[PDB]
C-alpha cells in the first residue's frame, strides 16, 4: 500500500496473510485474501498460478505483522485450491483474477471467529456503490513502487471507486478493463495498491454494511498518473464463488 496508513487485523479481521514453503525451509509472503466464510479464503489466481501446489501455501488470519506472530492469529493448511477456469494473463491486465483457498488446522478445524478474525460479506450480484465511493484496500504490499522489502505492519488506504467510462479512455487502461475489473484510484493518485498488495479486500460500506467489493489485481505502476488500481469485480463472480463453497 502506497501512502495509507498503518493499521491491526482488527480494523480488517477479514484478512488472510497468504505465505508459500519453499524448498529447503524458508517462507515467504505471497498475496492477502480475504475470509467470506470459517472455511474459505478468496484471492487472486495469478497469486498461485506459478506454484499451483496447495501443499506449499500457508494462510493465517489475526495476524497484523509480516515476520512475527500476533496474539490470537490462526495458521492453516490449504486443503483445497480452487484456480479459476477462464483465468488469461496479458502483459498488464489480469482476467478471471480470483481464487479459493479452504482453509484447515493440523488439528483439521476451519477459523474461529474473534476480535482479529472476523468474515466480510460478499456483495449482492451485479450490485456495486456509485463511483466516487470511498473504498478501503489492506495488505502487506509494497509502500513504494521501487521499495525491495514489504512493510512488516499491515496497512490500509481509501480509495474512489472510478466509473467503468473512465477507466477504459485509452491514456488510462483502454479495453485492459473489462465489466468483470473495478477501478479505483486516489484523485491525486498519491495512494494505491502494490505488488505484495494482491488478492487482498477492496471493502465499501453497501446496504450499510462492509462488503468485499473488490480484490487487488493489477495496475500498470503504484500511485500513477492516469493507472488506477484494477480490482476484481466480486459482484460478477457470485455464481462462480457459490459453485466452489
Ligand atoms: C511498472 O511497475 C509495476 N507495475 C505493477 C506493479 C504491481 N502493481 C499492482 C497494483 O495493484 N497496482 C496498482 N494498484 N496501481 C499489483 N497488485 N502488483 C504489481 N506487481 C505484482 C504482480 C504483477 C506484476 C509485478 C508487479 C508494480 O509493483 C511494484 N510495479
Redesign the pocket.
Known amino acids: 500500500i502506497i501512502g495509507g496508513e498503518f493499521t491491526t487485523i482488527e480494523n480488517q479481521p477479514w484478512f488472510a496473510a497468504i505465505y508459500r514453503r519453499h524448498r529447503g525451509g524458508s517462507v515467504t509472503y505471497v498475496c492477502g485474501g480475504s475470509l467470506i466464510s470459517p472455511c474459505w479464503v478468496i484471492s487472486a489466481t495469478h497469486c498461485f498460478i506459478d506454484y499451483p501446489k496447495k501443499e506449499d501455501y500457508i494462510v493465517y488470519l489475526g495476524r497484523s505483522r509480516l515476520n512475527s506472530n500476533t496474539q490470537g492469529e490462526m495458521k492453516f493448511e490449504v486443503e483445497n485450491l480452487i484456480l479459476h477456469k477462464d483465468y488469461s494473463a496479458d502483459t498488464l491486465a489480469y482476467h478471471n483474477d480470483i481464487a479459493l483457498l479452504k482453509i484447515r488446522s493440523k488439528e483439521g478445524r476451519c477459523a474461529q471467529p474473534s476480535r482479529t478474525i472476523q468474515t466480510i460479506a460478499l456483495p449482492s450480484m451485479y450490485n456495486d456503490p456509485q463511483f466516487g465511493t470511498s473504498c478501503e484496500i489492506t495488505g502487506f504490499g509494497?509502500e513504494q513502487?521501487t521499495d525491495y522489502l514489504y512493510p512488516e505492519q499491515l496497512k490500509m488506504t481509501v480509495v474512489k471507486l472510478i466509473s467503468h467510462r473512465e477507466c477504459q479512455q485509452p491514456h488510462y487502461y483502454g479495453s485492459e478493463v473489462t465489466t468483470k475489473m473495478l477501478c479505483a484510484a486516489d484523485p491525486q493518485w498519491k495512494t494505491?495498491?502494490?505488488?505484495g498488495?494482491?488478492g487482498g479486500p477492496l471493502v465499501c460500506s453497501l446496504q450499510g454494511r462492509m462488503t468485499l467489493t473488490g480484490i487487488?489485481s493489477?495496475?500498470?505502476?503504484?500511485a500513477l498518473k492516469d493507472?488506477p488500481?484494477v480490482y476484481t469485480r466480486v459482484s460478477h463472480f457470485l455464481p462462480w464463488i457459490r459453485s466452489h463453497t
Open positions: 509494497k513502487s494505491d495498491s502494490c505488488q498488495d494482491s487487488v493489477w495496475g500498470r505502476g503504484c493507472k488500481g
